[PDB]
């Protein structure tokens, strides 16, 4: 029952984005979109070279040497309609990075004396 929202489809991992299959995949998809269907079975009956053809060990190192382990959650995590947004536990009694930056608080907040006076 979400029913009224739209979401981004996917974000690729860093090794896949470092290999960069998305750029020439998008170029091939846009070229196919600008192609007519007459050109589509023309290229079917007479094909052409060069799909991506970058190398092999870049993808091999992306799978093995550039492999990063993701943040797997706990054994007792229950996912629901939310369960991806409550990341504040923003600690209590602790400010934010924007409050440290815009108010000029070095790593001294401007409300620190008021907070210490209120206890």
């Amino acid at each position: 029952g979400k029913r009224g929202i739209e979401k981004p489809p996917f974000e690729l991992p860093d090794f896949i984005k470092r290999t960069g299959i998305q750029e020439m995949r998008e170029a091939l998809q846009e070229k196919e979109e600008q192609k007519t269907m007459k050109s589509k079975m023309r290229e079917k009956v007479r094909p052409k070279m060069g799909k991506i053809d970058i190398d092999y060990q870049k993808l091999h190192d992306a799978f093995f040497k550039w492999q990063t382990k993701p943040k797997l959650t706990i054994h007792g995590d229950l996912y629901y309609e939310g369960k991806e947004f409550e990341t504040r536990l923003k600690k209590p009694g602790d400010l934010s990075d924007e409050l440290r930056i815009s108010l000029g608080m070095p790593v001294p907040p401007p409300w620190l004396i008021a907070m210490q006076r209120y206890g």
């Binding site: 000029g104 608080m105 401007p110 409300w111 620190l112 004396i113 008021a114 907070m115």
Partner: protein, 223 residues
Amino acid sequence: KRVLYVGGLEEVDDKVLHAAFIGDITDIQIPLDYETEKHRGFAFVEFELAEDAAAAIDNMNESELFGRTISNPQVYMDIKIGNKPAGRIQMLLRSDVVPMTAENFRCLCTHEKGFGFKGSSFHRIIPQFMCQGGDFTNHNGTGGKSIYGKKFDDENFILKHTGPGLLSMANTNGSQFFLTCDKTDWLDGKHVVFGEVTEGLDVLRQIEAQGPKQKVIIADCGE
């Protein structure tokens, strides 16, 4: 009528001012080009008709026995917005209403406690609501220390910020002190009003107009 109004003499000092007047008991030169010399006796206090236009470090200083050249302590702070002076706020800190906060503001101006408003800046300034400064530790209103420690209680909230130049102890009141340029009755009951600038109300209005977009800091200050 024992006090003088000797002007025309910042390069002068108290010893150089009192050497020509010596039996002067009081000699307090103002931050401008003016000084007042007062003698304890009666025959020695008639220096205006006796040593007028006296040479004080190769400069004539005309002496007139009057108060033309110019209790609740007055925090006289030349509050400078940026590199230029925005006026000398002589905020008469109300010792009749809040004596602890008034003495804290007077000591912060006089810089007798090692830190205070002489050299500090107001980093919490609002348009016609408050201009809070005096914190010499963190310089943002989140530091500062009073005479009793880092945080001290407010003395009394009998006075109210009912006009321009009204000073309050900002916060619970440590070294933070707020000058108000308009009505601040909504913040009454939390910030104790401890001043009313009869002189330097235009300096408080200029500080409220400048507030922070500019470094409003009282580099020179005193009682």
